[PDB]
């Protein structure tokens, strides 16, 4: 579920040529959401 | 009851074309004797020439005097008697209806039923009704419906665009919304002016030598979209753009753009400009006002 609605907050995903909008709201503005992945840091 | 914008359903019409042009060959052959296959049809149809702005015709002078009767009953049936049996051979191969058609056209009778009237095609028959309703509605001033017909039609994967005058006058009388008749026309010219037979008379054409109707009509009609004025340097910017030198009509379009822009020494240069393009429009097959009238407007300007 890669994206989030900016208005209603419903978590949702898209596909190839899909309605770039919330399937609940119909708001056309979506925030990306982010997934288990390795970023490495030095504690300094 | 209107022309259909589809390739005509096939077999019998083509084999009838065979019988027709084949018999035509045998009769005209023996006729030149007495005066002394898709390809047979092809050579056959082949050896033959294939106050307002009237693109005048070629009138009557320098044409040869006469002829006096060639064809009595006995002499004609002389020419006819043999090629009809040669026809008796492949008539035996064609279908009975086709054979009947050969018999009747060769008697000289003309068939009751059109190619459309005997056609029968299920996607094609539906397209026939679609296109028909287009032409009918456009005749009926029903520009709304007609527009629906046109959009649904052009949707279909079989239709290349003869239908453009339909949409030119369509969006023209529509006035409703969509990027309009001029936009369509200049689109037609921009897409179909670059490398980028049956169907084709002159009102739809190829850009080797004159594409006529749509081009000259967007030309004049755009100069009338300046009659709206009194955009121009645009229209004559893309009338400036193309080389297709046998026009002059775009020379009068050009000089009309300069008369419309002339409605201070700048206005002078525009009036000298139109004065120039009217003569470099005497270059070619003339579009003429008395043109001392053109100049008289130019002196009303010289005020």
């Amino acid at each position: 579920l890669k994206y989030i609605c900016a208005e209603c907050s419903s978590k949702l995903s898209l596909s190839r040529t899909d309605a770039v909008r919330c399937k609940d709201c119909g708001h056309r503005i979506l925030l990306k959401a982010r997934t288990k992945r390795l970023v490495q840091f030095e504690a300094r | 009851m209107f022309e259909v914008p589809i390739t005509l359903t096939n077999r019998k019409f083509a084999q009838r074309r065979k019988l027709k042009y084949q018999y035509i060959n045998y009769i005209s052959r023996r006729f030149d004797r007495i005066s002394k296959q898709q390809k047979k049809r092809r050579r056959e149809r082949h050896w033959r020439s294939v106050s307002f702005e009237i693109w005048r015709t070629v009138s009557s002078q320098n044409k040869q005097p006469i002829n006096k009767q060639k064809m009595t009953y006995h002499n004609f049936k002389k020419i006819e008697k043999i090629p009809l049996r040669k026809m008796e051979i492949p008539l035996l191969h064609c279908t009975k209806e086709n054979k009947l058609y050969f018999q009747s056209i060769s008697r000289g009778l003309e068939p009751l039923k059109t190619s459309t009237s005997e056609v029968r095609n299920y996607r094609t028959r539906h397209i026939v009704t679609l296109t028909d309703l287009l032409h009918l509605n456009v005749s009926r001033h029903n520009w709304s419906l007609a527009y629906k017909i046109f959009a649904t039609l052009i949707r279909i994967p079989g239709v290349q665009i003869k239908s453009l005058w339909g949409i030119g006058v369509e969006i023209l009388d529509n006035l409703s919304n969509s990027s309009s008749g001029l936009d369509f026309l200049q689109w037609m010219c921009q897409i179909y002016s670059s490398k980028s037979r049956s169907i084709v008379p002159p009102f739809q054409t190829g850009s080797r030598t004159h594409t006529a109707k749509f081009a000259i009509t967007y030309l004049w009609s755009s100069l009338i979209n300046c009659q709206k004025s009194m955009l121009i340097d645009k229209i004559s910017e893309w009338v400036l753009t193309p080389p297709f030198m046998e026009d002059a009509e775009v020379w009068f379009i050009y000089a009309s753009c300069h008369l419309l822009k002339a409605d201070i020494n700048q206005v002078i240069k525009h009036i000298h400009y139109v004065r120039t393009f009217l003569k470099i429009c005497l270059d070619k097959g003339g579009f003429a006002v008395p043109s001392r009238l053109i100049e008289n407007q130019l002196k009303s300007f010289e005020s």
């Binding site: 890669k2 898209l14 190839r16 040529t17 990306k32 959401a33 982010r34 997934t35 992945r37 970023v39 | -």
Partner: protein, 58 residues
């Protein structure tokens, strides 16, 4: 310090035009190192370290 950049690939298109460019990956052959910075949508994974020359968009 925070900087916000706007990537808008409708920048060229002539008004409500057919869309040429869509965020994501095609099926032709392209680097693959690209997926280190970019998620499947062609947008960058949040949190990613990014230095000059890296992809921020596909």
């Amino acid at each position: 310090m925070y900087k916000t950049e706007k990537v808008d690939l409708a920048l060229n298109r002539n008004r409500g035009d057919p869309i040429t460019q869509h965020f994501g990956f095609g099926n032709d052959e392209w680097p693959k190192e690209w997926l280190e910075k970019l998620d499947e949508d062609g947008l960058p994974y949040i949190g990613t370290y990014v230095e000059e020359g890296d992809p921020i968009c596909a």
